[PDB]
Design a protein around this ligand. Structure first.
Ligand SMILES: COc1ccc(C(=O)Nc2ccccc2)cc1NC(=O)CCSCc1cnc2[nH]ccc2c1
Ligand SMILES: COc1ccc(C(=O)Nc2ccccc2)cc1NC(=O)CCSCc1cnc2[nH]ccc2c1
Lengths: 252, 252
């Protein structure tokens, strides 16, 4: 592949995904997304080799609920990622449109997430920030994980390992908590610990302090409460999520 | 214990450790450190219960290379930690004094660190930021771990679990990297990836880009290089550190 193989169209995501463009492969007329990475920025961050490792794994993955990397190429000053285009936009945008999701839509999205995340763990695929703005929607409305782009909260910089500074610390126990947050946000319209100030959000997370609105059913409450456990080892696993009665009863 | 049992003296650490004071138990004349925590700040951070869990474990620990918590008490607006006083100050201060440490001093400190960290892992003791300013020195010059006080680097706040926001992500693989950084800093006088800007330090960590000065011996180079591995699973374990020939040859 070369740059000349593509017609570059409108920018996508208002910069939330980096320099990404709607594109068309000139000979096949196939619609896709092209992400442009600047070598100078990759070099200044020291991530060139980490990028190569991640894209090598991704280019071999195929899963209906993970955004596909079809391939990649480079020139003198840029690296180009050939990505699947999700025509229905982000789950964030859908949530904005509907205010909140019904139990069917939610349980279906949670199943797709649990499947995508399980697959990522088994294939050793790093993902970075599970949130509605990073979840995309395919032609049939199927959810696709797309969270692959990239004193501190982990301590002092000079002493921190690569996995901390490269955002590679979302393991399966972390993801379990994220899935509870997402389940709640899908049904309610906001994440459970949301507050005006960062300080107050911190407090609510640490205390696991949240309330269900009246419309949230007993089955959904059970699932969410069993995921949002302060103790990581006590959180309901991805396999157990897929077997939960509320998920079984409501998933398409 | 009550506040009235103690004479409170000079503040310690220039605020780097919070509100900490040199103190004396009035009846026994025993010298110790008293740390004052304000309930209002604990409550605003949502950490009251996490504090209780951590101090319960600590109050039962005894190890020559871990700073001891003798006990604790509270009143209407404060929590008080009764801590061991380390009379020789921080390893940071010692490094400032000497510029760099010889192989004997370094290997001895690394052994004490590896012992302290091993014990922490086995007893499930959370520690937060391994660096010279957080390492203290006892009456005989023995090293004591004291790192127990507390968009992001881990992603978006609303979706992050308690273990990320509470600084509880330093597991044994993270600690292995930290131990390599410390070994280098002890021998050289600065950590290996130190640079004027945060961006450049990030780059050097991600690339694992560092150089040994000529005076660093083959055995020390081997130890450091086997700890500073980009891949976490490839780092030399704490048991293997204690068995390393350079450590055996030089540790007191
Ligand atoms: C598989 O995907 C990715 C693979 C790799 C990277 C990446 O940047 N890796 C990296 C960079 C530097 C250092 C290390 C690693 C990013 C993505 N994915 C995205 O960036 C989000 C979708 S952009 C496309 C897209 C599609 N369909 C849409 N529909 C609406 C908006 C939209 C936007
Ligand atoms: C075992 O130790 C600790 C136990 C608990 C905590 C803590 O704050 N926990 C916490 C707080 C809020 C939420 C959750 C958890 C801190 C320490 N340790 C220190 O704070 C550093 C040494 S202060 C004493 C000391 C001694 N000896 C010195 N020599 C020179 C200076 C100096 C300074």
């Amino acid at each position: 592949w070369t740059l000349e193989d593509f017609d570059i169209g409108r920018p996508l995501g208002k910069g939330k995904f980096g320099n990404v463009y709607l594109a068309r492969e000139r000979q096949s007329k196939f619609i896709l997304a092209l992400k442009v990475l600047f070598k100078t920025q990759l070099e200044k961050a020291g991530v060139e080799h980490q990028l190569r490792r991640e894209v090598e794994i991704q280019s071999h993955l195929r899963h209906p609920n993970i955004l596909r990397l079809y391939g990649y190429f480079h020139d003198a000053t840029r690296v180009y990622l050939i990505l699947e285009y999700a025509p229905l936009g982000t789950v964030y945008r859908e949530l904005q449109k509907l205010s909140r999701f019904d139990e069917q839509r939610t349980a279906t999205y949670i199943t797709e997430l649990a499947n995508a995340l399980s697959y990522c763990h088994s294939k050793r695929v790093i993902h970075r920030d599970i949130k509605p703005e990073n979840l995309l929607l395919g032609s049939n409305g199927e959810l696709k994980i797309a969270d692959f782009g990239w004193t501190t909260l982990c301590g002092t910089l000079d002493y921190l390992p690569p996995e901390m500074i490269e955002g590679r610390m979302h393991d399966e126990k972390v993801d379990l908590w994220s899935l509870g947050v997402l389940c709640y946000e899908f049904l309610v319209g906001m994440p459970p610990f949301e507050a005006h100030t960062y300080q107050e959000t911190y407090r609510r997370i640490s205390r696991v302090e949240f309330t269900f609105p009246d419309f949230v059913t007993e089955g959904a409450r059970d699932l969410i409460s069993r995921l949002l456990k302060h103790n990581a080892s006590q959180r309901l696993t991805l396999a157990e999520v897929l077997e939960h009665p509320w998920i079984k009863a409501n998933s398409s």
